[PDB]
Amino acid sequence: EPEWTYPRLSCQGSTFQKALLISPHRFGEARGNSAPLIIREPFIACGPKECKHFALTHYAAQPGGYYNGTREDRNKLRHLISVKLGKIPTVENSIFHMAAWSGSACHDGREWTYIGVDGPDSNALIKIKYGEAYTDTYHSYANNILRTQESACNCIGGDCYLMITDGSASGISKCRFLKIREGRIIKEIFPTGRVEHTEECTCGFASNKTIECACRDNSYTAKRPFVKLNVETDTAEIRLMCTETYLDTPRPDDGSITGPCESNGDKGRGGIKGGFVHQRMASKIGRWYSRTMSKTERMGMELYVRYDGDPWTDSDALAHSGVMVSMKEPGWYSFGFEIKDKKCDVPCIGIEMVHDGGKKTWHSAATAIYCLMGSGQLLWDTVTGVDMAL
Amino acid sequence: EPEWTYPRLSCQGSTFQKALLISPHRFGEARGNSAPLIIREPFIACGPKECKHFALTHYAAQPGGYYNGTREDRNKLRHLISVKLGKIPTVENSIFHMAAWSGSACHDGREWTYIGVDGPDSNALIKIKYGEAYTDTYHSYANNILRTQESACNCIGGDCYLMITDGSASGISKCRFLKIREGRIIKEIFPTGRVEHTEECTCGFASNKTIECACRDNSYTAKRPFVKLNVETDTAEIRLMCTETYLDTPRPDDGSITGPCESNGDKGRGGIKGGFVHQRMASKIGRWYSRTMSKTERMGMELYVRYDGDPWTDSDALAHSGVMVSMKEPGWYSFGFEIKDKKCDVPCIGIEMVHDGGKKTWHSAATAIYCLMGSGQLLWDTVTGVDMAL
Amino acid sequence: EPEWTYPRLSCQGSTFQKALLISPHRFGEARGNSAPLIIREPFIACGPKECKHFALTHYAAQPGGYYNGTREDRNKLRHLISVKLGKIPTVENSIFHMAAWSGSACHDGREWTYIGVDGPDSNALIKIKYGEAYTDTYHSYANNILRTQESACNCIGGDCYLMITDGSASGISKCRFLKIREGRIIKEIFPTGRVEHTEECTCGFASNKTIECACRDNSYTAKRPFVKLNVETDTAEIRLMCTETYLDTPRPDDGSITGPCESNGDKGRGGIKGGFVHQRMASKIGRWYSRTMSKTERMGMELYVRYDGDPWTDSDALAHSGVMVSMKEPGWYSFGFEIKDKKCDVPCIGIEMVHDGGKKTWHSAATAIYCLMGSGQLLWDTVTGVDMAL
Amino acid sequence: EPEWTYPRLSCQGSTFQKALLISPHRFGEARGNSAPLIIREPFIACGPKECKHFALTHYAAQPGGYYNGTREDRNKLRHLISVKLGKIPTVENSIFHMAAWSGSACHDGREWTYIGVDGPDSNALIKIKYGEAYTDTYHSYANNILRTQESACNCIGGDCYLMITDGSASGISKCRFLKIREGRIIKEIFPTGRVEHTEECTCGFASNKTIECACRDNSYTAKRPFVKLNVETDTAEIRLMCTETYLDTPRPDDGSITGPCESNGDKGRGGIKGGFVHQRMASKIGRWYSRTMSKTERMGMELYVRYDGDPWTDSDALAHSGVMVSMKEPGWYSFGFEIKDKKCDVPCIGIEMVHDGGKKTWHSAATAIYCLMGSGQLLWDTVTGVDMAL
Ligand SMILES: CC(=O)N[C@H]1[C@H]([C@H](O)[C@H](O)CO)OC(C(=O)O)=C[C@@H]1NC(=N)N
Ligand SMILES: CC(=O)N[C@H]1[C@H]([C@H](O)[C@H](O)CO)OC(C(=O)O)=C[C@@H]1NC(=N)N
Ligand SMILES: CC(=O)N[C@H]1[C@H]([C@H](O)[C@H](O)CO)OC(C(=O)O)=C[C@@H]1NC(=N)N
Ligand SMILES: CC(=O)N[C@H]1[C@H]([C@H](O)[C@H](O)CO)OC(C(=O)O)=C[C@@H]1NC(=N)N
Ligand SMILES: *[C@@H]1O[C@H](CO)[C@@H](O)[C@H](O)[C@H]1NC(C)=O
Ligand SMILES: *[C@@H]1O[C@H](CO)[C@@H](O)[C@H](O)[C@H]1NC(C)=O
Ligand SMILES: *[C@@H]1O[C@H](CO)[C@@H](O)[C@H](O)[C@H]1NC(C)=O
Ligand SMILES: *[C@@H]1O[C@H](CO)[C@@H](O)[C@H](O)[C@H]1NC(C)=O
Ligand SMILES: [Ca+2]
Numbered sequence A, B, C, D: 001e002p003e004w005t006y007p008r009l010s011c012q013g014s015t016f017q018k019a020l021l022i023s024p025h026r027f028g029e030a031r032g033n034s035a036p037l038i039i040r041e042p043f044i045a046c047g048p049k050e051c052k053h054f055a056l057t058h059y060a061a062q063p064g065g066y067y068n069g070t071r072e073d074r075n076k077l078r079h080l081i082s083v084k085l086g087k088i089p090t091v092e093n094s095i096f097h098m099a100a101w102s103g104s105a106c107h108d109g110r111e112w113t114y115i116g117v118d119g120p121d122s123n124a125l126i127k128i129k130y131g132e133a134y135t136d137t138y139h140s141y142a143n144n145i146l147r148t149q150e151s152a153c154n155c156i157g158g159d160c161y162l163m164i165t166d167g168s169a170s171g172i173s174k175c176r177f178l179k180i181r182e183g184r185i186i187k188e189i190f191p192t193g194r195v196e197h198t199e200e201c202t203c204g205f206a207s208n209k210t211i212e213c214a215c216r217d218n219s220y221t222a223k224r225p226f227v228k229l230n231v232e233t234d235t236a237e238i239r240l241m242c243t244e245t246y247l248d249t250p251r252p253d254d255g256s257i258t259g260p261c262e263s264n265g266d267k268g269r270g271g272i273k274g275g276f277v278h279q280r281m282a283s284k285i286g287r288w289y290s291r292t293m294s295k296t297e298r299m300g301m302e303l304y305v306r307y308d309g310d311p312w313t314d315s316d317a318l319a320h321s322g323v324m325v326s327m328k329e330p331g332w333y334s335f336g337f338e339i340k341d342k343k344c345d346v347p348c349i350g351i352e353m354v355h356d357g358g359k360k361t362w363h364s365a366a367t368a369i370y371c372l373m374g375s376g377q378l379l380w381d382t383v384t385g386v387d388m389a390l
């Protein structure tokens, strides 16, 4: 039958470049004839032959009559959808997978696993589907909005790992990792370390033995919670990223948080999901990240890379590697993913560029993709091109 | 060739949970750019690899100009259509299988069999199609609207069984079962027992030897005719469900039908097609059923279960297992179906949620899907989200 | 590689029944959101796994701004298109195959052959495509609108046969048959007999040795030219159908043409393409035909069958076998085709139901399908359901 | 695996004929319900099984609200897109391959390679994608709009060759050829000879050892730079076509450029990309070319051929072989491509037919296709049928 997928060394390259923009709302004018779905929280996951562009829709299209409520996060209509990457996610092109206001998905070499969360805020539910079949669920353990990544989960040898968390957006949210095999939870991993708040982890394989995640702390710091998960022992430990280049929004000025690596610092309340992807080379490991250009608003998006070291102990600034979205453009969630070439994996970061005109109108997003490509430096930025008044 | 499908034991689990909502008319606004088909009597049937969401279209879209007639049942334009479960049944996404104002379909492991009925009321006709080929028909035997299930037929080792019935909607309608192999009827099975009115059976496998059906009596009782068809002998017997939880609409209060199990009781005229699906375990069988929350109108929908016992003699209440559709929301036909996971079958119930705004405007439906998924209790209900004035 | 296709015995059955209606313009209202293509001359051809519904479009959709000219037969924009049978032929669902104002197509077991005719009226061109590749052409031999069937060609052992004709619509048009193998003309067959005018032949296999065609004579008779083509010798002879049930429109009353089988009779000028398909049984051959209900206008469509005999010498009336389209509905071109079941072929007749409001508005058609199905008699008729004012 | 593609001898034939017209804006009326994409620089490339129709979209549809900018060449929204040849390149039918304002693509027998260029004018970048994976890039070497073919690249035994160029549009632009294998550049080939300005090469195989290109000189001459690239040594040489039939637009009258073959002549500034395709026979090679009917404007398009000889020294007129687009109709870029029949290759030329209504309104194009087909002479021209005011 198909072989189980494993992380492979990354394809040769030393800079990211602009790849593709899926800007569905370039076709949503009242005088046009299209039906782009109103979405937020897009992410991409690839199998050996194809990538799927996922998102949580509000089950409404532009132009339409259901714009009121599209700036709300959770409700009974939101669903996990996808199209093949490169197709415009319209009413007719998309697949509705399950009811969900928080999702994830990944391919293990043989089939797709889709994860969706819905239920009341105080008692929500992780629902897992493997192909066509709904296969398992997991219960709220802290009864305050159980939720997951909003990016791809990660499979090795048929075991797919997924961060879930539950708890207050203003207090404690201790995340946990599920090991899912063929749609069924075969292990629950309870992390050790700086565990007071970890959510919206962007995860990937550092090697066949370790998964790493750059996460969001919505209450205490602008440094990202950084997870190291040993896949063989099924143990995880979390400590804050020590780099002075704080990747969350809001954040203080770089290098202004004094004291040891663990110090929380100022402007900790609030957050944003951030891009992170690995370049696995025979000798070294590159960790690529993205953060907004604004320190306080979801505007702009810049690339950073650091080779080797320990993200937990190194205060050194990450190397600035290009402006993907200028400060004039919206820069909201970003996520890492990998495209499978014939013999190696191509690391990419995707960026959600939300069209926000507030609650009085529709609310949705475009997705920009940057990927490792050749050498030199990043050459061009992405604009969505949408005028929200049309 | 691929091999014939057989019922297997159900995937482990102990509660249903909200799975998927296909609400096409969320995109049918006059200022939108979509063409959801006007449909009624939706149902789902799955093969080894995919599920198809079938329905009986009025061959008209919303927005459109052919709303006069969409509250009629039978007319020369009605057709059986489908999309892969998860696609929006729109004009371009659907496949039109045959002219039909009554339908069923199922997969035997190798190919799909589609059943449609059309023709004048006095002389209607069952038409069978295997794949692309029209293979056989069956004539009206009581000359009064020959009709069928409006839910999946059931195949075992290549033999697919189908309830057909014929006769007065407020009188006698003695059903019969067709045994169809590769699109040709190879046997007629004439049931025994309480046979005066059985229609719209929701059937499935209780094991490899027995198919059971929960049906509608539109004339005499609010209790459901319960069919047990022995697949090895190709014989069937029907008796009324004895449970005090009357599953039909309209119905009297639970437990008010005094006297022996077969007593018809009060508020017998009228009916609704009802959900029913089996959870086969090694030494226990679960029978899951759905009924409206209103005793008289097609509003709401609640889940019920009972493990083991004989439906024909057990007067005990069914155990209530969640509100799938609130009293506020439409709850029309419901049906059972199973999804094929790798080693086991997943029981589900789907719910037709009709948008009823009277004869004065368009008429159509959403489909809500609930499936056995994990443990605990059912967490959330479904709303269609459609404002019929847009 | 795939086996070459051959005619097989027909599936068991003794009556045709209503199968499917593709009425695209049920979705073309000015207030709707669809784009049905404006077409005429539809036909269907099936391979082992799928049928394709072909037609000549005017390269215009309803609603639209290019209605003027859609009642003209030939122009530089017309093209042969198709969708999979059961899909609505819209702008996006259809495939444009080649420029063509006269077409044909058939599958030989391995690939599809598409034939299209365009060029000036005095010097047009047969163009043949095999899969993606344009492979051959044939030249006008009488320099007066070279044209072909407007129905499926017929392949046996990899040789596909096709009627083409050229000459005056009011005078002599001596048809010829091409034997095409893998897109290339390997033989030209010059018919013998009553050859003064044969066009728009509907052809099919009577056996592995003989192809037969019921054709149109636009100038001299209302009896159809009937072709018998021996596939082994590659010779064809044509004589008029002798049945008193004249299948052309216009036509005199049945049985009013006195004299021998060859007599032309009255009301010979004008014509219509007619349905014809074979039911090949081990012992006997049924020839199924269709003609309009009106003797003079393209209104209504009735089925007729005759078993055995010689169509050239038998004056006997064909057996009336059902009203497919009533006299209130449009009945224009009709064609035969066969659907491949697992072990046998299912004969069908398709009917073009044109929406004609004259030259001041759009002009297009619906396609109704009737197929051999069970026993008894034909039970229901087809209406397109379209109101040309919406 | 499948094997590598090699040029083969061409299918037998001696004239081109009108094959297919893809006119998307026949469906772009404000009162219609379609979304044809606004595109320019279309081209076609075929693999063993299918052809893809590529183009450079402005990421806007007709009707729509983003027409300001559609007469620009380079901007951050331009993307390489495709549909299977014969599908209408609409918003939902197309696949968006990468951000690109200059492109090429071709199939090597196993997979597709897509090439896009974007980035600032002074520092643009070639991006290569093999299948789904972004595999390599190539930097600007003259810092003045690095660009490529806008027609198919060409693969032999897995090596795909591509013309890239860089430099002033009214000065020096010395092209280079990239040899790409499975999406990675394995060699740069620096041409020899008349090298001062070569761009938008239309390339193809003259045999298994030589690729030839007919290119555009936008600065100095109306004669086309003619490249002969030896595939075995990976060396190229460029000299101007000596034919008195100048293939560029603008151009002086045929034969007015006096002096030796390499004389630049008059009306050299400005240009157009031009069609060119080979007809390989056992002992003769046919070179087919297209040019506008107007000597100064992009109006009309005529076919020309010459068999054998050396394009670099033969001053003889090319033989005129038909009007494909009349003086009345737009004739913009043209390109060559080959379709793969079972045993041989079919030469074709496609023509971009731009709808030009000025800067004041939308701008886009149809594509007309002519292919070698049978014998005789070319019979009919192509019109787009689009009224730009609708
Ligand atoms: C489950 C849920 O509602 N998650 C929210 C998320 C969350 O709200 C914060 O992370 C605080 O915990 O914030 C945001 C956000 O954009 O700030 C988007 C998410 N929207 C959705 N996932 N639908
Ligand atoms: C054959 C037919 O017309 N079936 C009717 C059905 C029927 O009248 C009752 O069951 C009484 O026999 O009622 C209903 C209904 O919703 O009450 C829908 C069905 N409509 C369709 N399935 N088309
Ligand atoms: C090639 C052509 O123009 N054929 C005509 C056809 C023909 O005109 C008569 O058969 C007389 O020879 O008539 C008709 C018709 O509907 O009467 C339709 C055809 N339309 C198209 N094939 N486009
Ligand atoms: C790279 C680029 O911008 N190419 C231009 C091209 C160019 O200006 C000339 O060849 C001079 O170098 O002209 C034209 C043109 O139609 O004249 C189209 C191209 N547009 C695009 N392919 N996007
Ligand atoms: C991971 O392990 C698999 C299976 O043993 C191997 O194919 C793959 O190349 C390994 N990845 C590395 C070395 O990064
Ligand atoms: C039914 O029998 C088949 C073998 O004939 C087996 O594969 C399947 O598991 C059985 N299922 C039940 C529920 O007995
Ligand atoms: C036609 O010939 C083929 C090949 O010999 C055979 O398979 C088929 O059954 C024959 N058809 C008849 C007997 O009608
Ligand atoms: C080129 O060579 C290949 C074998 O390497 C052969 O298949 C093909 O026919 C040849 N074509 C020409 C034009 O020489
Ligand atoms: Ca924070």
Ligand SMILES: [Ca+2]
Residues within 6 Å of the ligand: A034, A035, A091, A092, B033, B034, B035
């Ligand atoms: Ca739509």
Ligand SMILES: [Ca+2]
Residues within 6 Å of the ligand: B216, B217, B218, B219, B220, B221, B222, B223, B248, B249, B250, B267, B268, B269, B270, B271
């Ligand atoms: Ca009842």
Ligand SMILES: [Ca+2]
Residues within 6 Å of the ligand: C216, C217, C218, C219, C220, C221, C222, C248, C249, C250, C267, C268, C269, C270, C271, C272
């Ligand atoms: Ca006639």
Ligand SMILES: [Ca+2]
Residues within 6 Å of the ligand: C034, C035, C091, C092, D033, D034, D035
């Ligand atoms: Ca459309």
Ligand SMILES: [Ca+2]
Residues within 6 Å of the ligand: D216, D217, D218, D219, D220, D221, D222, D223, D248, D249, D250, D267, D268, D269, D270, D271
């Ligand atoms: Ca020039």
